[PDB]
Amino acid sequence: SSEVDGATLIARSLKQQGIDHLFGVVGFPITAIAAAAQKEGVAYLGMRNEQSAAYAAAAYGYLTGRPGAAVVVTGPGVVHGLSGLANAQQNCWPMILIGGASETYRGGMGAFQEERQVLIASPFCKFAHGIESVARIPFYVEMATRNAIYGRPGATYLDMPDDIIRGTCETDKIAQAERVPEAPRSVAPAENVEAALDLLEKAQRPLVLLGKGMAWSRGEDEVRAFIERTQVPFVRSPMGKGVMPDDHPLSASAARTLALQQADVIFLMGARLNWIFHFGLPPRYAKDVKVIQLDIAPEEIGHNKPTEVALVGDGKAIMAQLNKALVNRQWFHPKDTPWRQALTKKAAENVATIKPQVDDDQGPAGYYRALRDVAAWMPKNAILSAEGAGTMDIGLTQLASSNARSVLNAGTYGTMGVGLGQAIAAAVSDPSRPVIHLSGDSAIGFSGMEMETLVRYNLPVKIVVLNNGGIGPGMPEIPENPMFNLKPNALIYGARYDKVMEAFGGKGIFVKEPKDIRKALDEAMAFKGPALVNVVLSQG
Amino acid sequence: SEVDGATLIARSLKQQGIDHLFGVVGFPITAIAAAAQKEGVAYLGMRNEQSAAYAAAAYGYLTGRPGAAVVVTGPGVVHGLSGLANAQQNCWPMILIGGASETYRGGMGAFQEERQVLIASPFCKFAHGIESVARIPFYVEMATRNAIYGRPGATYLDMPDDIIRGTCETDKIAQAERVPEAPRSVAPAENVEAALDLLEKAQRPLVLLGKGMAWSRGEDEVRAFIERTQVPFVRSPMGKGVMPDDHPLSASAARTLALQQADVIFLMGARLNWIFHFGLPPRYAKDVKVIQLDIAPEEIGHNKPTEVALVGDGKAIMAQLNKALVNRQWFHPKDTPWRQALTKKAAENVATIKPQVDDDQGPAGYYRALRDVAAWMPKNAILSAEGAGTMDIGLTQLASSNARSVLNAGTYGTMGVGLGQAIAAAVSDPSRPVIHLSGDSAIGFSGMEMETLVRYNLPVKIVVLNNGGIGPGMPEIPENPMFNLKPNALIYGARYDKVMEAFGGKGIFVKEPKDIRKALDEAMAFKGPALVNVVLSQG
Amino acid sequence: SSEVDGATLIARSLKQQGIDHLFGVVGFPITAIAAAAQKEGVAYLGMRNEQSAAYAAAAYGYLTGRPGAAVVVTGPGVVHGLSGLANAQQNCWPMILIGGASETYRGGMGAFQEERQVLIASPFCKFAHGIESVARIPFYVEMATRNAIYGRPGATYLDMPDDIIRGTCETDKIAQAERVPEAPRSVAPAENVEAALDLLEKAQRPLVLLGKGMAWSRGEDEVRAFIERTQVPFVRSPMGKGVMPDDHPLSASAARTLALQQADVIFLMGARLNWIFHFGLPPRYAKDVKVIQLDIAPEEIGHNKPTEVALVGDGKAIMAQLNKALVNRQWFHPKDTPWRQALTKKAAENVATIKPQVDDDQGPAGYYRALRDVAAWMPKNAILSAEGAGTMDIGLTQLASSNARSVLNAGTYGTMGVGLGQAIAAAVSDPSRPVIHLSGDSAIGFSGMEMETLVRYNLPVKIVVLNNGGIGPGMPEIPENPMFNLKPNALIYGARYDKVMEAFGGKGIFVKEPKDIRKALDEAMAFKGPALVNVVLSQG
Ligand SMILES: Cc1ncc(Cn2c(C)c(CCOP(=O)(O)OP(=O)(O)O)sc2=O)c(N)n1
Ligand SMILES: Cc1ncc(Cn2c(C)c(CCOP(=O)(O)OP(=O)(O)O)sc2=O)c(N)n1
């Protein structure tokens, strides 16, 4: 019975919206929400820090198409949780942060962990609101959900006072709500679709720029049909990896700088001309390059660089339009244009310049030598998580993707500390696929304690640490008087993160010699549980 | 060879197609107003930043390009927040240009130092400080794009004093271009057909017209749709004129019955916010089905679940539906029970009100006074309205024939927009008369702008319905008024007409209903601003 | 009964805190609060704009020593009201803004005038909070009051939802609260008091800087005893006027620039080294000037200019300490030092440079000629309100003050639009004293409609408008095509604001000839009600 409590109703509302997992760290006043989630069919993962819980929620949202959810305690719980709200806002990922709030009737008294939580969360959110009654919990979870996954996805925050979590409400008084339907689709006008193909027809050096917005739209099939039909070369953002297969002959990634610099028409597909693509401006682009832009957010059209043809709407639906329109066209990009020859030639020279490093078996291993074994060992159906600077940037050029939404990295915000949260999100989003987490030694220190979480929930994430002893290469040894003589970027060289995984009950392997890398990787993969292979890296 | 900051921001406003600039000058923005005049941007100096920012917002709606206001440091911005909020709420495009104190005085307590981006941000789609002269064009372009693309809204630009006075070589200025008209998105073919399918099966279909369709400038497409389908319609106050009010398919005179009984409502650029009572019982059938046409995806299903979503531009999507209606024989028959019920109820409601329309006893009531206003309204007028009873009754009795020709308190229900919005109407199209219908309380928020009307020769015709308060007041001011005067009460018959006379316009005071039309005609004939002050019944 | 409604309890709580007047503009949902105020002994003034209501509240707080209160409607009411919060924050004046809020159970639905009101008001406030229940209304009004008048005074905001205003509560369930006592006083350590007198002893050119913080502290008597005992010259901020009598022989105001430039010790008494005193820095000050600073706010000590001796605490209590300590000292500033001779000599030259303008009877009048008649006509016990640029800045040098807290002007924020709000606050704070409002023609246009309020409440404010046809001097006539040819600063020259006062039922007088100014002033003063004398001003 006849009555529902606040904790039960918010958990029930998460399930109603199709949210199957909940990340958090319990304590006053939200422990009952986690308990209620488990009884309402929502799996709960108790993390070691709200940072990881909120970052996992954000990535889980991207992977599932419904909002990710995290639940955090009053005060410092929300402050820690802001990390995830910012990351979801920046990446255009859907999430709900549920923040506990102190008793409503203690306002102004200095209650335990009293904080202006809607105020401090609002800058990161599409929608942020306090829940004033049990009866309207379903309304607020529905509204948060809609604002998270409609349009440009983003972050949302809900404040749940302690006396609301513990309050109760008759069933006939609960607000009516419904599962938020899959987002409505908008498509381009016919003339815009034709104008896009017209511009491509005239291009001497066309280039497609693939971003994770197309992965979020789940239009990889439409994109693949388009690229195959038009035979236009493509480049890709790090998490746009896999929308097209990296090992496709039309990939210009190995000649990326030349491609952007010389293209006369770029086709943005769910990608922004922000820092990742160097703003679409010289010296990285031709000053007169013309832009075809496909984005769901109207305000992004013409950002930084004017757009010639705007395709505002859903990536999958609009790419379907272009494929249908290509039936009535003879045009395709010839296989032997100077454009294709130039990109092929430069790609080969760049790969040749790097080959000596790939084949260098001298120890300690460099990035390219270590990643040679990782690349050969990657399962084709793996979800790849990557975090770091050199380890991440080189790792994602050397590890090819074949499926979309199968790369998770530092993202638009360049955040360190998302690593194991995003790995854990990948692992619970699809337990049938292996999850590889490639990390630098600095990155793993932000969230390393989540290794305990990996063992606790039997999540067999395979971690590979490339260890050069710092944020970038460190020093050969720790000097005396380190507070003044140790480089700010330096960490213990060869710090035994493998022994940390062992400590909690996983498989840790320490590798100093390149010849032993692949054996460690195979052993880590065979272990039925989480593993960490700690590879000593050259500092040169 | 060199451009100064004041000149470059004025030049950038012109580049973006912004032809007027409202403001109140003073440190440090006077040079921006002067530069606007030299760059082809007309400047109107107002008497308060409230009116300037409200005018900017309405000007944006009327022109399709952002309205612009310029205000001084500190309190200038705080006053200007009023307009940012109103533009945010109405989904209207504007740029507020706020002067900022010297960058090198940060933290010292400079004259009118304030955290202006901080305090303006909650109201804005985009808010940013301009750090250099060279990137002025970049920021004005970005503000413009964010103001008029998608759901339109407010934007704020901070201009430090040393930037306004700074200079930059031409070869170093940021490149920028006029922001093109917003790109259009349309509905998938199946959604268009699903919309017509739902209307076909409806026993009691109803179209809800909002000002988003007016902003989209799709009145022609809407008119073709209503005529083809013969579906009745209701309208928001500023949605007035998208369809002509005097159309046989208007259900406005039976609005409560229509909303309560419809089984399919078609939202056209209208929200199920307070204006349409959230789409919920007791004002709607609990099982009503919704067709929703809106440019903002997040609005789809707000408060009430949507059956068919048409996300994109109103004009473009209504064109789709009209083309698709060629492949259908269906239209709503003229003699359905629905049409008969609405016709019957409309007639009973009009009959209930007629005794008040025809009551010639003085002092006049709302309906008697508005009888003369309605007969006197020019067909091509832009109507500005502000108040409570004066506004709500005025907009039911004064029929609109053109879109974007009604300006009222809007989504935010703001008092103080009156003369700002009237002035925006007057400079947006000087070839059309502008009527401002106001209550006596409303005119007190912005009344000093009458001086602005005379100064710029703007012939706004003001009609004040004067009942002596926020709603009816008292017959006289009692003794010890701080304790005995009702909080809502104002001087009954306060001579706002003599205020217009004071500044050089035509003021006429009318206490007898038989003299109302003569005063209106005389006000209209005067070649300048006018105010007819009509004593209203307090019962 | 037995039960109290929200409107009644907040009005009752205002009275409990000693707030005797309430300014506002009624409408949904706060009309009941204004009605309740009148029955609880709190006078209500219904204004024509929330700007004036909030500005009046702020000045009323300064004048009364208890917080001023304003009540505004939902949404735009609060947005308009922010003007007053900012002005109270900037001037260090106590006020409570009571903002109506939409129904709690309509959150997120788009209710009539729904707004994030605590969010948008917080930047201006020492304390801002929503009132969640009727029972705790007294608590929140007490807490707002304490934060408004303790320490550095400032602005506070209280959010009152519609369903709280209309809600009710049993008397036994109402929160207990008490009248906030007069602020506790802090004083300086004995060594600091002696160090201050030591520094003054050694000074060759000492100068006292009097600010309105001393007026707020109501320590004018202690200051007057100190100046008379030490015979140290003084300057004064515009609203610091009257702490010392302006016509005192130790006033250096007529040589203000020289005084600040040459002083070797400045004694800040409730004054900031912000823009009003030119930051205490060269070229306006000696580079090596030493500072004695008396302020209640510790963070202000050493702001912009290092402080030699800090006197942190209440101005009245600390000045009492210095007077007691001066009993054990022989030192005083000699009457014939080069310092005194230099200031006397420069003052005389500055007054002589201006005399031709004071005596210029040619029409139209200039500032100094018009203010000659105003000065002779000012009642000695008047409260002077001033607003404008030239009209205000010249007016306050020519119109001498004899009492503290008897000048109200644009203040720290330099705000236009405070004029009639502050005049009205003066008029209801002490009906036994005349109130003069000196205004430029631009300033009166910000709040001019409040003339109706003056007639409605029989407030006999005497307005004097110096009319030069713009923000500063305008043009002789309005040109053709004014949107392009009228100077941005220009207004109708000689706009008949006198006829606006006549319109509403006051006494308006238009003066073009200087010889008629005093007759108009006398006639305005004799009229038993509000008056406006509109004086045509030279544009040169
Ligand atoms: C929250 C946060 N803190 C710090 C950084 C700065 N940062 C840091 C600390 C990185 C670590 C790089 O070191 P690594 O060991 O992970 O990888 P490599 O040594 O192979 O470059 S990459 C990077 O941008 C960041 N982006 N985000
Ligand atoms: C900024 C602000 N202040 C106050 C209000 C409240 N308000 C006020 C003060 C109105 C005035 C209505 O009185 P009127 O004389 O304009 O018209 P009627 O007397 O004919 O109702 S209508 C209304 O909503 C508001 N909406 N916005």
Ligand SMILES: Cc1ncc(Cn2c(C)c(CCOP(=O)(O)OP(=O)(O)O)sc2=O)c(N)n1
């Ligand atoms: C809210 C606001 N808007 C604008 C200004 C700028 N401003 C304005 C508009 C002033 C008016 C000066 O003109 P006046 O007629 O009051 O006086 P004078 O003509 O005698 O200088 S003084 C001043 O600083 C301001 N300070 N505050």
Ligand SMILES: Nc1ncnc2c1ncn2[C@@H]1O[C@H](COP(=O)(O)OP(=O)(O)O)[C@@H](O)[C@H]1O
């Ligand atoms: N369904 C969708 N269809 C098209 N564009 C979308 C869709 N969802 C999101 N987007 C857009 O995709 C873009 C993703 O940009 P970004 O995060 O910079 O990608 P990347 O880092 O891979 O370059 C955003 O501008 C976002 O608005």
Ligand SMILES: Nc1ncnc2c1ncn2[C@@H]1O[C@H](COP(=O)(O)OP(=O)(O)O)[C@@H](O)[C@H]1O
């Ligand atoms: N070009 C457009 N096409 C369709 N809808 C639009 C367009 N521009 C804005 N809108 C939408 O129109 C709606 C206007 O709603 P609202 O202001 O509530 O109208 P009203 O007050 O007249 O009912 C908003 O939801 C806005 O997103």
Ligand SMILES: Nc1ncnc2c1ncn2[C@@H]1O[C@H](COP(=O)(O)OP(=O)(O)O)[C@@H](O)[C@H]1O
């Ligand atoms: N009771 C008090 N005793 C001493 N200083 C006070 C007291 N109340 C306020 N103050 C301080 O007085 C100062 C007033 O400064 P300000 O407003 O700049 O004055 P003015 O404009 O007259 O120069 C502030 O720093 C404030 O903290």
Ligand SMILES: [Mg+2]
């Ligand atoms: Mg490293």
Ligand SMILES: [Mg+2]
């Ligand atoms: Mg009225």
Ligand SMILES: [Mg+2]
């Ligand atoms: Mg002037």
